[model samples]
Target: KHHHHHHPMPKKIVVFSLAEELYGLDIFDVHEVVKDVSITKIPETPEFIEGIINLRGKIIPVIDLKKRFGIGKRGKSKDSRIIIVEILGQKAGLIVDAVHEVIPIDENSIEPPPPVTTIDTAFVEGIAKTDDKMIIIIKLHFLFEVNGKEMLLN
Candidate 1:
């Protein structure tokens, strides 16, 4: 007799840039990309949290990587973009200096994190090697595990 088997779905991811760094988000949760626009400030949020923006009447929290990653000065640039993705069903946008491309990476391509990786490794799902570059896959689900995550509101 012959047996049937099933394979796990390959995670879809979006690769983008923050300063000179390469970052990625699981494409299954990433909804879409939107143009940079003014955001409504939520006074009590952290500096990394850029507050909320209205998208088709739905409010979405936006995060600035420059602030979160402790990279450089915060502000919009010609190459800057907002990545709108859903985390735990709630929609939120993350601002970065620019977005690169969307690529499908296989599970095998994901190697273990480097020895000197930061403690924030929880947000990193895995790593993938592209034809020309290596990508860091982010665990979008884990970002909301903090303090009840008022950060994501659909």
Candidate 2:
């Protein structure tokens, strides 16, 4: 007779708040969280493109989730942060109202996006239902893509 132990793999997520809702991204894709920094405006860029910032000598474009999702404007606050992530072989920053914490979500707890959701389903990987709140898992790659349209950001 043999005894075996089986443990479910935990999905680590970087959780943050946008407006009044909670959202998360897979920890594997996130590089770091940074304080709000000055971004230089570029001509002929999309409205959602907040601009670009020099991070440790690397220039990375920043996206405003509020403007990207059309969820009103992001307010000025000390709590605001830029979540640095890799998308399509490039680094980009996602502006959030605030960062909460990195949490482990059970793989089984994640479900397909509901028919009705506050954010766009095209960019959603799934929804995590926890005891206290719901976190929307985002597929960041899909964020800048729509149908066959090319993303303006380089």
Q: On residues 50-152, what C-alpha lDDT tens digit does candidate 2 reach at each position?
A: 8888999998888888787778675648999898998888888899888788888777789999877878787788999765898888778766664566465
Model 1, 1-154: lDDT tens digits are 9654686556576778776667887776667888777778788777778888899998888887667656657444787777898776678788867777777667677987775563266666777778776677766665544466545453
Where is model 1 more than 4 Å wrong at Cα? 1-12, 74-76, 114-119, 144-154
What local lDDT does model 2 show for residue 53?
A: 87
* Collision pairs in model 2: none
Q: How many steric overlaps does candidate 1 have?
A: 1
After TM-score superposition, the amount by which residue 110's alpha carbon in candidate 2 deviates from its true location, in angstroms, is 0.5
Per-prediction count of colliding residue pairs?
1, 0
Of the candidates shown, which would achieve the greatest TM-score relative to the real structure? Answer: 2
Which whole-number lDDT from 0 to 100 does residue 154 have in model 1?
Answer: 30
